[PDB]
Amino acid sequence: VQLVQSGAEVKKPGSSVKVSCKASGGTFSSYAISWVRQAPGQGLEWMGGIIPIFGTANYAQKFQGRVTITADESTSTAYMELSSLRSEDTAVYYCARSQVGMDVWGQGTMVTVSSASTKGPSVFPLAPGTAALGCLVKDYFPEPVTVSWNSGALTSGVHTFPAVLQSSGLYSLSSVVTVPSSSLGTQTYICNVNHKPSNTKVDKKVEP
Amino acid sequence: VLTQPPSVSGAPGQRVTISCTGGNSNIGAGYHVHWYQQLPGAAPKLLIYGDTNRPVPDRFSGSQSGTSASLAITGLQADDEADYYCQSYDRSRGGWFFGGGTQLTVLPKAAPSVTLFPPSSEELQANKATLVCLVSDFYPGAVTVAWKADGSPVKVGVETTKPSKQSNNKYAASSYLSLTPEQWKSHRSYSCRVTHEGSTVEKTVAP
């Protein structure tokens, strides 16, 4: 079984967001689906839950009046709608199945509540018995971006560092890879950056 | 509702015990205590359920007494460093609520490796300049980063990250100095200094 969730979203303070949670095999309805948020650096917060087959929902007192948990047994998809968003709601929202203890969690959906606007990155190449090359993913918003090398063929010596929120409100990240110096002439190294919030994908070749 | 120690640490092969205490409305009165493991940058996983049952290696175990529960990890491994959350049903508030979480750390000091990248030619042609000082493979997390242009401390344009955890249980970090092409060309050298447990590594680049 697997629980798949909708993509990351950017919303402005006061708007409403709706995160989905579809099943990939099982009796989605006879189980319960819990929704739990986690803010950056904080712990888990049980927002609520629902048993679909019966249609019955429960909400923690904290998010009561703002959160609506619904479920479809046909599509086997739960939905959590949060209204009147705030800067503090910015967090990753997980859905977790549990027979009616949570044993099947989802990948999590990042919901960013900020009056800013989504922007794609500028990917610059950082040129070099060991040389080190890399890629600088600058001036993008919001988190996250994903970086691979040779489309995944290169994993040896790869290090993707955490981003930094620049004073401009845009993030900047770096991913480096250490390689033999002698191979710099023959082999080709390309970093593949993907920023799904802005639907950007860039394959930048790092040349000496 | 549930109280957890903010952090626990132990060397490889040791037995660690994380506690989770509440009142008679949650852990007391019968309601079981679940234990979840969250690895750096991942979704939680169910370690223990029903106070002592496993879905999970035998090294992990759980116990419950009175208004307290405890998770025991024997033969500590590097893969065990992670956040541990205890969950229980509160009867007064009527709902399943987590604890503060415990950051289990698996422990030898280690000085950092620093790599300084100067601005790209393309970036300079894009009316931008960014020097990148990458730090890796240092334990503990504490680390200071300072920038100097021609020996004068640069304090404007500096953006540094807080030490994050690597996959090898050590730490990494990154610092960025933002300049205009003319600023970068008007000095003869820039340098980043990474201080860690009294030992500083300094790297320098020059136009």
Residue numbers in the entry:
A (entry chain A): 2 to 101, 108 to 135, 143 to 222
B (entry chain B): 3 to 57, 60 to 111, 114 to 213
What is the paper's account of this structure, in its own sentences?
Here, we report the x-ray crystal structures of a leptin-neutralizing antibody (hLep3) in the unbound and leptin-bound states.
(D) The superposition of the unbound Fab (orange) and Fab:leptin complex (light chain, cyan; heavy chain, light blue) shows conformational changes, with a root mean square deviation of 0.44 Å for 220 Cα atoms. The largest difference occurs in the CDR H3 loop (heavy chain residues 100 to 107), where residues 102 to 107 are unmodeled in the unbound Fab because of a lack of interpretable electron density. Notably, we observe only minor conformational changes in the Fab upon complex formation. Consistent with other antibody:antigen complexes, the Fab antibody undergoes limited induced fit upon leptin binding, enhancing shape complementarity at the interface.
